[PDB]
């Protein structure tokens, strides 16, 4: 069996500690890693150690900056999730020249890149005419542009069940993200864990995003971080499989 555990998110369920960020443990490779140190301490009440590798998901400070209580490991990002990420006037973006000196970068610039058996970064999703929500900018050279999260990637975890999606806040759309694995792998989605970042989105947003989740057959979906109870509220009305809460503790187990 391969498990997976949530060791950072906003809520928690007794014991472990919670914070606005994401992490989570995805069988040999760790997903993102919170804000601050949460994550460890939640592992520690777990026992676990963590593996080498850590895939960020983009370059903000609530999935990159638990990587300043880490060293040695090697870290998977983009190129640009360099690029200095603000949201409206308020920085947010991630210490990389501390995190590359104490860690190792390891740079992703394919749409698809292979990590170990049957895991899978996928690149940017497809916009398909969409763009971001909400007010989120980059510099790159000290030039202020809007921020389409060039960066932004998601883990693929082929499984004999179907595929396993791991994403951290899908700025490029939950639903341009799936389409996009639709689109790459034969295989069936079975299960969706991440934050879909839902919040300023509006309920016919959701509704439509839910429908993606339905006409590609996925059978369950585990909605953390960024979502928002309103957006979960929609999926447990109208998506057509199992919805799961997410909390810090939680712990998944899943055929290989
Ligand atoms: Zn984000």
Redesign the pocket.
Known sequence: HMRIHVLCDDSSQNGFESEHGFSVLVDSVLFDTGKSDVFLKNARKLGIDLPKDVLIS?G?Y??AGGLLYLSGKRVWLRKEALDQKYSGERY?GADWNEVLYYNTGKFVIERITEIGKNMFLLGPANLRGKVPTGDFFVERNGERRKDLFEDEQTLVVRTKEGLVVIT??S?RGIDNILLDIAETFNERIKMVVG?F?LLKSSDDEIEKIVKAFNELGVETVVPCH?TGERAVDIFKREFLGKIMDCYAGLKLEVSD
Request: hydrophobic share 10%; proline share 0%.
């Open positions: 983009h903000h609530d999935h947010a951290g806040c700025h934050g970042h960024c």
